[PDB]
Amino acid sequence: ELDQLRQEAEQLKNQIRDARKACADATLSQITNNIDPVGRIQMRTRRTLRGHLAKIYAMHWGTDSRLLVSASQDGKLIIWDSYTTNKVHAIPLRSSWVMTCAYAPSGNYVACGGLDNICSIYNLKTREGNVRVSRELAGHTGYLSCCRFLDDNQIVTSSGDTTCALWDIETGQQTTTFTGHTGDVMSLSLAPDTRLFVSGACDASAKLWDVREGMCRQTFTGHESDINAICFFPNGNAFATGSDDATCRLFDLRADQELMTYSHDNIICGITSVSFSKSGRLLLAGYDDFNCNVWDALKADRAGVLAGHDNRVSCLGVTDDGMAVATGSWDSFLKIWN
Amino acid sequence: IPLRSSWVMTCAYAPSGNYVACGGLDNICSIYNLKTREGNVRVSRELAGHTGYLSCCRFLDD
Amino acid sequence: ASIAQARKLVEQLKMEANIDRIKVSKAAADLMAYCEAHAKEDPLLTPVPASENPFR
Amino acid sequence: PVKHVYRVLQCQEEELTQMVSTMSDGWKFEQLVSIGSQAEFLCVVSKELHN
Amino acid sequence: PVKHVYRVLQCQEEELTQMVSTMSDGWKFEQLVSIGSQAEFLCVVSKELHN
Amino acid sequence: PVKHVYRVLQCQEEELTQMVSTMSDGWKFEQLVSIGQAEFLCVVSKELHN
Amino acid sequence: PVKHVYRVLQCQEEELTQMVSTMSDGWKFEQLVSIQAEFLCVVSKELHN
Amino acid sequence: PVKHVYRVLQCQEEELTQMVSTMSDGWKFEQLVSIQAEFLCVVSKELHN
């Protein structure tokens, strides 16, 4: 008898697609052909700061625009000073797989987590001169994948057992719980106005929730592999994602349609990270081909290439003001570009 | 991997790829689990029953 | 089971159905205007003297 | 009964006192080595955890 | 009373952290020595066998 | 359930015996490195229980 | 813990593993100094009587 | 509770074995440093009163 329910679901999907198709009323190529392209660019590496003795997996800037955190493979955090290239802290850990890192916008909290199924919070600023753990957040049985602070007292996690949830730091137990994500979540990012966030999927799916209640308002589709990186345009009405099969797609919330597609012929590698600049005129991406190149948003043409590393590139970040680019590969070096 | 005995004359590899074995004048064959949580190697099972010195070891399967 | 599943189905998908669907050309024009207006905030595209960048 | 975890930390000469004097809550000190000496160092650190 | 077993291990600089941080279960840590440095260190480890 | 405190002291070669033989009450001896006529280092420890 | 006995052994570079791995019963290990390449070693025993 | 006393001894290479193998009753061995060749040594005693 469930066949009738499946058939009515299919016909509802067909009606939704028919309603969606008509409203697409702009091919951006024919309207943006008039505007001139950007010129060629070449930048120089300025600082090569060392200190890790393993494979780096993550990094994250701070609002101070002079501090960034890093997590290695054997368990270690180092907080760097980008102007002078001196480390201000060095925290050991109790686990040997740390794949995520977050820094607090206020400036006195750092969070971690990984394959050990526990998220821990560190209190940098203490009355005494030492550093000590504050809380641990257990409860989910998968491996942790990502952590972002909504605020000093609210944290959102990304589990591996098809779960996303929030927590209350003082109590230590969950406040709200999300579900309905069939695949595996591996990335998510927050809107500038701290009201919405989207999550990636293993089976090429995009979801958009609301923090207050937790209703899935739209859904996006179109890739054929895992979505590894999700970013936002500064205005807040478009998010660009990447995938393993050398495709980068920009979607529009109001359109619900794939606007453009940035593909080139001589690439067979996977994307690991993407990021927009301040204005949003350029788009950067990383490859497992040991290199990295800078793209353009409007005309889908490559502006230039960057001198890569001796191994795979696994992270990328751009400062809020836009005067710095930092890249970290698997050979234990960080690069500063300008 | 360090070992507790001072005479080992045999060594085998698993066809799957996550087991090894040892043996010698200690009259004991020991199995090691390379693949486990975090990074470390710990003894899985320790056999006994024959009073001679072990000479060879081959895996038929895991 | 699958009954619960179909329940979830009718529940959300019909929530997806009643959403507003607007023009795309207006969104593209707004994006272009936003990109053009903030051209003064991109040190990468607009070069600055050596005294400006501290990372040197 | 008892277990142990070990970590290796690298620190240059001028930033040695700040790292040694401000260790964490529970980690111990075992040995300091001079490597490739301006001057580089290594510092093994141990923690003991039960159950 | 107690007993002890000692072993010597050799390792270059590039592969020091991986072995130190991924040591086995039950073995301890002893002096670390620099020999012929480049690198070519010499670790010493210990285990306690009671009965 | 014990705590420890570590400090680093520098002393030249001529000023070694006078500093080692006249330590304070409670502090211990951990390590002595040959940095760098000759210059040395030293690490001491204390146990602040309760 | 009432007595201690200390001894100094010298061994060349090629004879480290054979001497360390085959120590006697009741003797400990404390230091190893770098004096080819020669070495030194100090061992201890506990005579509680 | 417990106390400790530390002393620094100097010795050339030829006179190392005689001093190390013939220590006093109560004094331990902690560190041997290398400055023909000169050495240093630190010993300790525990004074419980």
- The one-letter amino acid at A142: G
Q: What is the dihedral of CA A50, A53, A57, A61, to 10 degrees?
A: -30
DSSP-assigned states of every residue in A204-269: SEEEEEESSS----EEEE--SS----EEE-TTSSEEEEE-SSS-EEEEETTT-SEEEEE--SS--S
3-state DSSP assignment of residue E21: helix
Q: What are the b/e assignments for A137-168, b being 16+ CB within 10 Å?
A: bebbeebbbbbbbeeeeebbbbbbebbbbbbe
Q: What is the dihedral of CA A222, A227, A231, A233, to 10 degrees?
A: -10
3-state DSSP assignment of residue A196: strand
- DSSP β-bridge partners for residue B22: B11, B30
Residue in the block written with tokens 């809107």: A191
Whether residues H37 and G35 touch (CB distance < 8 A) is answered with: yes
Catalogue all structural domains in chain A, each as residue range(s) with its CATH number: 1-337 (2.130.10.10)
Residue in the block written with tokens 């702009």: A26
For chain G, how big is the Rg over CA atoms in Å?
12
- The one-letter amino acid at A97: W
For residue C23, give the nearest of A25, A217, A338 by CB distance: A25
> Residue B49 burial (CB < 10 Å; 0-12/13-18/19+)?
exposed
3-state DSSP assignment of residue A10: helix
Residue in the block written with tokens 């990372």: C55
Pairing verdict, β A230-232 and A238-242? antiparallel
- DSSP β-bridge partners for residue H12: H38
Rounded Cα distance between C41 and A329, Å, is 29
Q: Give the other-Cβ count within 10 Å of A278's Cβ.
A: 21
Whether residues H42 and F20 touch (CB distance < 8 A) is answered with: yes
Rounded Cα distance between A182 and A203, Å, is 8
Asked if F47 has any chain D CB less than 8 Å from its own CB, the reply is: no
Q: Give the other-Cβ count within 10 Å of A177's Cβ.
A: 12
Asked if H38 has any chain G CB less than 8 Å from its own CB, the reply is: no
Rounded Cα distance between H17 and C45, Å, is 73
CB within 8 Å of A133: residues ≥ 6 apart:
A120, A121, A122, A123, D25
Rounded Cα distance between A201 and A207, Å, is 8
* Angle A135-A139-A144 from CA coordinates, rounded to 5°: 85
Distance from CA of D24 to the nearest CA of E (A): 18
Residue in the block written with tokens 């990468």: C44
What residues in E contact B2, CB-CB < 8 Å?
Answer: 7, 9, 24, 27, 45, 47
Residues counted in chain E: 51
For chain D, the straight-line distance linking the first and the last C-alpha, in angstroms and rounded, comes to 8
Cα-Cα-Cα-Cα dihedral sign, residues G12, G14, G15, G20: positive
Contact between A263 and A222 (Cβ < 8 Å) = no
Rounded Cα distance between A109 and A60, Å, is 13
Asked if A94 has any chain D CB less than 8 Å from its own CB, the reply is: yes
DSSP-assigned states of every residue in G3-48: --EEEEE--BGGGHHHHHHT--SS----B------B--EEEEE---
Size of interface E-G (CB pairs under 8 A): 28
H-only helix segments in chain A:
2-22, 28-32
Which residues of B touch chain A, with CB atoms under 8 Å apart?
38-39
Q: Give the other-Cβ count within 10 Å of G5's Cβ.
A: 12
Q: Give the other-Cβ count within 10 Å of A239's Cβ.
A: 22
Using N-to-C axis directions, what is the helix angle for C2-17 and A2-22, rounded to 10°? 20
Residue in A208, A225, A306, A235 with CA at minimum distance from that of residue A272? A225
- The one-letter amino acid at A327: T
H5-12: strand order across its sheet: H5-12, H38-45, H31-34
Residue in E27, E29, E31, E33 with CA at minimum distance from that of residue E11? E33
Contact between A98 and A111 (Cβ < 8 Å) = no
Residue in D16, D4, D23 with CA at minimum distance from that of residue D40? D16
Residue in A261, A268, A276, A284 with CA at minimum distance from that of residue A41? A284
DSSP-assigned states of every residue in A29-41: HHHHSSS--PPP-
Contact between G27 and G41 (Cβ < 8 Å) = no
Measured CA distances, D39 to D14, D31, D34, E10, E30 (Å): 9, 17, 8, 24, 24
Residues counted in chain C: 56
> Residue A251 burial (CB < 10 Å; 0-12/13-18/19+)?
buried
- DSSP β-bridge partners for residue A221: A205
* Angle G26-H4-G35 from CA coordinates, rounded to 5°: 55
**Assigned token pair, A52:** 């890790």
Pairing verdict, β H5-12 and H38-45? antiparallel
Q: What are the b/e assignments for A11-45, b being 16+ CB within 10 Å?
A: ebeeebeeeeeeebebebeeebeeeeebeeeeeee
The two most distant CA atoms of chain D are separated, in Å, by 43
Chains with ≥3 CB–CB distances under 8 Å to D: A, E, F
| Angstrom resolution of this structure | 3.3
Q: In chain G, which residue's Cα lies nearest the Cα of E7?
A: G21
**Assigned token pair, C1:** 């089971």
Rounded Cα distance between A53 and E13, Å, is 10
| Region of A113 on the Ramachandran plot (φ > 0 left; ψ -120 to 50 alpha; else beta) | left
CB within 8 Å of E39: residues ≥ 6 apart:
E11, E12, E13, E14, E16
Rounded Cα distance between D23 and D4, Å, is 17
Residue in G46, D31, C32 with CA at minimum distance from that of residue E43? D31
For chain F, the straight-line distance linking the first and the last C-alpha, in angstroms and rounded, comes to 9
CB within 8 Å of H40: residues ≥ 6 apart:
H8, H9, H10, H31, H32, H33, H34
3-state DSSP assignment of residue A115: coil
Q: What are the b/e assignments for H22-49, b being 16+ CB within 10 Å?
A: eeeeeeebebbbeeeeebbbbbbeeeee
Residue in F17, G16, G34, G35 with CA at minimum distance from that of residue H14? G35
Measured CA distances, E26 to A74, B41, E16 (Å): 19, 11, 19
Rounded Cα distance between A229 and A244, Å, is 10
Rounded Cα distance between B23 and F23, Å, is 53
Rounded Cα distance between B8 and A337, Å, is 54
Rounded Cα distance between D47 and E5, Å, is 22
- DSSP β-bridge partners for residue A240: A231, A250
CB within 8 Å of A197: residues ≥ 6 apart:
A148, A156, A188, A189, A190, A191, A208, A209, A211
| Region of D48 on the Ramachandran plot (φ > 0 left; ψ -120 to 50 alpha; else beta) | beta
Rounded Cα distance between G4 and G43, Å, is 10
3-state DSSP assignment of residue A8: helix
CB within 8 Å of A292: residues ≥ 6 apart:
A284, A285, A286, A305, A306, A308, A313, A316, A327
